[PDB]
Structures are given as C-alpha cells and as structure tokens.
Design a protein around this ligand. Structure first.
Ligand code: 4TI
Ligand code: 4TI
Length: 650
C-alpha cells in the first residue's frame, strides 16, 4: 500500500478525515495514495505518533512546527497551506513593529515606551516581540508578565493580568480580552497606536493596509527593523521582527513519506479543493471550523525538499521562541567558522587553537550546507565565491569583508594560440571549460554575457560539449570532465577539472575555451605548476579573447577581459556583522601578510580582508549588472538551497 496516515486531534477531525479517506477512493487509481485516520488527544500526541511511526502527517501552527522539529521528534515541513489567491499564493505572515513617523527611537530603545499588543499569548502581538526582547527584560524574568510590566512604562496587553500587573492595562484599563475592548486584536492594537495611546504596535504586515486606505495616511507610520533603523510600512519584507508560516503539514525527516503526502494533497485539492463543487470539500466542514486544514486555505504548495524546520520558521522566529521556552541569557563570543572538507577543517582547528578561543570550527559537507548553518546560527562565517554570495544574500546573509589580492579580479576567456579561428564573436559549437556552474569566473560572467547574445541559458545546446562541474550528469557539459565513478562532473576536488586551475587543465587537454581569472594561466605555466599536465606549458601558447572580437597575450589581460569580477567575500548574519568585522581584522593583523594544500578557507592569493563601507548587501557588493545576469541564469539553475530561500522570499 501507498497509504498516508493522517493524524486527527478531535472527533470532529476524525470524521472529516474519514470522509476525506472515502472520497479519495473514488478519484484515485488503485496504484495511488490512500488515506488512513489516526485520532489522538492533541497536537503534541500527533507529533509523537508521527515520530514513532504510528502516523504520517498532520497540519500545524508555527509554534507546533517548532515542537515537532525538536529531538526526539525531528519532523519537517512538507506541504504549506496557501491563502488569498491562486495567482499570488500567501504562505507566510510578517510580524512587524509599527511606529509613528519621527517618534525618534529604534528597536534597541523600547524600554520605557508605551506598547500595544493584539493580545497576550498571540504570536505577532506578544510571543514574537516579547520573545526577541526577552533578554532585555529586567530580572527576574519569571513571571513573564511582571518582567514586561517593568520594561514598557505602560501598555495595553489584552488578557494580561491587570490585577497583579496594572502597568499592562494602562492604555486599556481592565485588559478586556474581547472585542468590547477597543484595543483588542489587530485593528485594536493598531488603533491603540493611531489614537496616540501607544508608541508602538506589535501587529502583522497587513494590519496597516487593512486600516488605512490612503497612502497619505500610511506615510505617517514606519516600521522598526531589527538592525535598529526604520523603514516605510510597505517595506515589511525587509523590516519585520519575524516571518511566520501559517499552517504547515509536517512529516518525519527520514522515512517520509513526503512524496506520498504531496501526491495525496495535491490530487485532493484538484478534485475537492476551493470552488470544486463536490459533495465533499477539503476546506470546510459541516462538523465545525478549521478541521485538518484552515477553512480559509485556497490550496497547498509543496515545501522545497531542502527546507528544514529552522529554515522554514526562519532565524528571527526561532530565536524568539527558544527564548520563551528555554529562558537563558548571556553575560561576541567566538566566531564559528564553517569548513567544507577534512583539509579545511584541519587548517581551521589549528587556527582555532592559535586564536586562543576567538575562532571555533564547524564543518559541513557542502557549501550550501555551510551557508544553511550560518542562516540558522549553527555557524557564523565563511568565505565564498561571488556566485555563493548571491545565494547567501537571497537567503538573508550579508557580506562583511572582501578578500584582496593586489575593484577586484579580471574574468577572462583563455584559448590555445594554435587554433587561431576562435573569437568571442562566435564560439557556437566549441568545447568549453568552466570552473563550476554558478561561479563568478567560470559561469556567471561569461554565460551572463553570452545570455545577452543568444537569449536563453541552455548553454549545453550552444557549446558542442564541455566540462562545467555541477551540470546534470547526462549533460553535454559533463562530457569532457575527468572525474571517475560518482565523482564525474562533481563541483569538488575529486573532479580534476573543477575550479580555476581544473578549467585551465580542461582547456589544455580537451577544450577550446576556458573561463577563468587573469592569473590562472601565469600561475600554471613556465614550470610553476610541476604536475605533468602543466609542467611543460608556456603562457605564450595561450591567448585571451577580448570583447572586441580580437585576441591578445595572456599578460595583456587588463585590455582583454570579459569583465571585472567581484572578489570572494566573507559572509555572516546581520546580527554578527559587527563581531565578525572586529575579530577577523584583529586575526589578520596577527596572522596575515606579515594552506597545506591549496585555497583552504580563503583563496591562496589573498593578502588582506577589506572593509566594505557602503557595499554590505549582496546587490551592492556584486553590482546590478552581475545581479541582473544571475537573475537571467536562474531560469536554468539547479540550486536547491536557492530554491528554499526564494520560496520564502521570491
Ligand atoms: Ti496574531
Ligand atoms: Ti570566484
């Protein structure tokens, strides 16, 4: 059987689940998914059932998505309910802090102000802001209401205990826990700000737009960002306290059956979803409200498979809720560097002990895994090719420092001098060598420029064949690669044509054109590289293709390049930007220009780690032309972390 066991947490839900079961039988072929129904006492029991292999799937709110993720449950998000509309599916809501224009304070300045909350215990209006402010609250932090009552000078916090903590009901005497209190709920809490009662209102991104029809009025309001700046109210996507998913189907991390659940839910929406007019309807029940799914849902979206619960809830939300559950507070710490190999780890380990604690080490198996650990706080920093910076940036990370070599390197197209046919003007049908797909020199620049000329990104149909590590194994752009077994065409060291040098090797041995950097050929010719394939080459036998259509010697790169490359950059979270900026400059003035293999942690031709000033965004660091180009190349991108990040922020 291909059966999905759906977990119900009430008798009304089990009835609906059984009806679900029975109607699906009429629409799904016998080799298709079917439904079984397991009734438990509560969401937490469902979670346990699923983790114990007595059930398979349940739909949860964000706080339970969190519980479900914790050991020993280890469930993950697999399907999202969406709202509003088929054309523009709404999956998340943003908790925001709204304030009046020119009220003159930042998030790190909330102590002593007046606050408006939608209601005690509510997500946007209470658990998130109080969770993120947790360690700012005065001691003792239990009971929590007491500590909040001594942080804000006065508040309106519906359903708080005003009898014990009157300060909390100062702007709404009684703390009425119903719509009889004028300041209850979303519009209530917004109204509390608008009427001048409060200085800040903890609400959802949409609250302001639902209460103020004219832009003229909304301009009188702003949002507090976590980075202690303000932004306009329609910029909540870049200025929110937390991004939060509405309603999320979860499942075991290993053991699924993710695939079956999607095939089930997807077919269910297609026959029984919103507006499908059958006697059974997936998103209502005669038996009561919100049974197994929210009645307001318009359907389901598949959660990208790379996504785990920390990633899906997001860093700010997880921080907030950990604080509320654990309640632990500090009194820069150590920068946790991310290693990608045994050899990278060994350099990092001896860096750690040499830094005397200031640096610690964490490893992952791929760059993307490392980036994900930085997103979620398992790690803090690593250095990355510009192509990975773009991905890190789309995932909410920022560049802090650039690696310097001497404006950065030159991206160049190398060819054999002998074959004097080749020109930039027509490389159609030629054999190409790339460092890896998605890297600056190897891909993003050259194929960026190439995209403008052919108006598609199926480059495996432009070139005859090639080696471009990270391509699909059966692609013509894996035909020239030299890795054996599972390593063929892999973007790592077990593929000998991977990377700057690898791509040049590829040209020497098999290719017609190699996309690399200006100092690749010089460093691998004239006997400098002793390996048999490079030992006897001299740079005079190689030429560069200029945008002109002409060709020039290798050392002539300054007048014969494809474009200026952004340098490789250190990235981190905005919340560690300052600590990473400090420690690394303090570490490089100790261990800089004053690896045991090649290019470990930082490129080997790096002299110093440079300040960025105004370029501390991926867009500003890479430049707009680079970003536009990568945008065009995504149409053919295979990056599953990028797919996860963009699911959350299109
Ligand atoms: Ti709420
Ligand atoms: Ti690079």
């Amino acid at each position: 059987d291909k059966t999905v066991r759906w977990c119900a947490v009430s008798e009304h839900e089990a009835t609906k689940c059984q009806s679900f079961r029975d109607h699906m039988k009429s629409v799904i072929p016998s080799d298709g998914p079917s439904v079984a129904c397991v009734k438990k006492a509560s969401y937490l029991d469902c979670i346990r059932a699923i983790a114990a292999n007595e059930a398979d799937a349940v739909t949860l709110d964000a706080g339970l998505v969190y519980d479900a993720y914790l050991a020993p449950n280890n469930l993950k998000p697999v399907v999202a309910e969406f709202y509003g509309s088929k054309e523009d599916p709404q999956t998340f809501y943003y908790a925001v802090a709204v304030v009046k224009k020119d009220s003159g304070f930042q998030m790190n300045q909330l102590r002593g102000k007046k606050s408006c909350h939608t209601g005690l215990g509510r997500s946007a209006g209470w658990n998130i802001p109080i969770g993120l402010l947790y360690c700012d609250l005065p001691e003792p932090r239990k009971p929590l209401e007491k500590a909040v009552a001594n942080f804000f000078s006065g508040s309106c916090a519906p359903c708080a205990d005003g009898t014990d903590f009157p300060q909390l009901c100062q702007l709404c005497p009684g703390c009425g826990c119903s719509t009889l209190n004028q300041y209850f709920g979303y519009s209530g809490a917004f109204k509390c700000l608008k009427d001048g009662a409060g200085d800040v209102a903890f609400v959802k991104h949409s609250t302001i737009f639902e209460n103020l029809a004219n832009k003229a009025d909304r301009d009188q309001y702003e949002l507090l960002c976590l980075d202690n700046t303000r932004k306009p109210v329609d910029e909540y996507k870049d200025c929110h306290l937390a991004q939060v998913p509405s309603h999320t189907v979860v499942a075991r991390s290993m053991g699924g059956k993710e695939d079956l659940i999607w095939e089930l839910l997807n077919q269910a929406q297609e026959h029984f979803g919103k507006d499908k007019s059958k006697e059974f309807q997936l998103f209502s029940s005669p038996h009561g409200k919100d049974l197994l799914f929210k009645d307001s849902a318009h359907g389901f979206l598949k959660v990208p498979p790379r996504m785990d619960a920390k990633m899906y809830l997001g860093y700010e939300y997880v921080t907030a809720i950990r604080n509320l559950r654990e309640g632990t507070c500090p009194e820069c710490k150590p920068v946790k560097w991310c290693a990608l190999s045994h050899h990278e780890r060994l350099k990092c380990d001896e860096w750690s002990v040499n830094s005397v604690g200031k640096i610690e080490c964490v490893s992952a198996e791929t760059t993307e895994d490392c980036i994900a650990k930085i997103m979620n706080g398992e790690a803090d920093a690593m250095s990355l090719d510009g192509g990975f910076v773009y991905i890190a940036g789309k995932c909410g990370l920022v560049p802090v420092l650039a690696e310097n070599y001497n404006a950065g390197y030159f991206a160049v197209a190398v060819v054999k001098k002998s074959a004097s046919d080749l020109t930039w003007d027509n490389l159609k049908g030629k054999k190409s060598c790339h460092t890896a797909v998605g890297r600056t020199a190897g891909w993003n620049i050259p194929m960026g420029l190439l995209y403008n000329k052919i108006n598609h990104c199926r480059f495996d149909e432009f070139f005859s064949e090639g080696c471009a590590p990270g391509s699909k194994k059966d692609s013509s752009l894996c035909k020239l690669c030299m890795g054996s077994g599972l390593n063929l065409c892999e973007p790592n060291n077990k593929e000998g044509y991977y990377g700057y040098t690898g791509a040049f090797r590829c040209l020497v041995e098999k290719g017609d054109v190699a996309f690399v950097k200006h100092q690749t050929v010089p460093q691998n010719t004239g006997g400098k590289n002793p390996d048999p394939w490079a030992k006897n080459l001299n740079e005079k036998d190689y030429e560069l293709l200029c945008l002109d259509g002409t060709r020039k010697p290798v050392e002539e790169y300054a007048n014969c390049h494809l474009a200026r490359a952004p340098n490789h950059a250190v990235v981190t979270r905005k919340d560690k930007e300052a600590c990473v900026h400090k420690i690394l400059r303090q570490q490089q003035h100790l261990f800089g220009s004053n690896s045991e293999t090649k290019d470990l942690l930082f490129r080997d031709d790096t002299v110093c780690l440079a300040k960025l000033h105004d370029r501390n965004t991926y867009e500003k660091y890479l430049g707009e032309e680079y970003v536009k180009a990568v945008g065009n190349l995504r149409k053919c991108s295979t990056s599953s972390l990028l797919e996860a990040c963009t699911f959350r922020r299109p």
